[PDB]
């Protein structure tokens, strides 16, 4: 099963929204947010 890169984040839960899939969505979204904000928290923007 080759890698597929997972199109737009809510891709899964738009087909048969379940508890586990919704928890997964929340988790990955907040992980991305946390990483980006930490990188900008300490360093800042290019200018």
């Amino acid at each position: 099963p080759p890698e597929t890169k997972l199109p737009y984040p809510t891709y899964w839960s738009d087909k048969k929204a379940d508890t586990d899939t919704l928890l997964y969505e929340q988790i990955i979204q907040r992980d991305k947010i946390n990483k980006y904000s930490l990188i900008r928290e300490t360093n800042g923007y290019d200018p």
Partner: peptide, 21 residues
């Protein structure tokens, strides 16, 4: 042709498989 499926917590997957994966 094993089409991908929606993700489940790891423990339920490795328990349903019942084989060392």
């Amino acid at each position: 042709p094993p089409k991908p499926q929606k993700p489940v917590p790891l423990n339920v997957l490795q328990d349903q498989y019942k084989e060392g994966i």
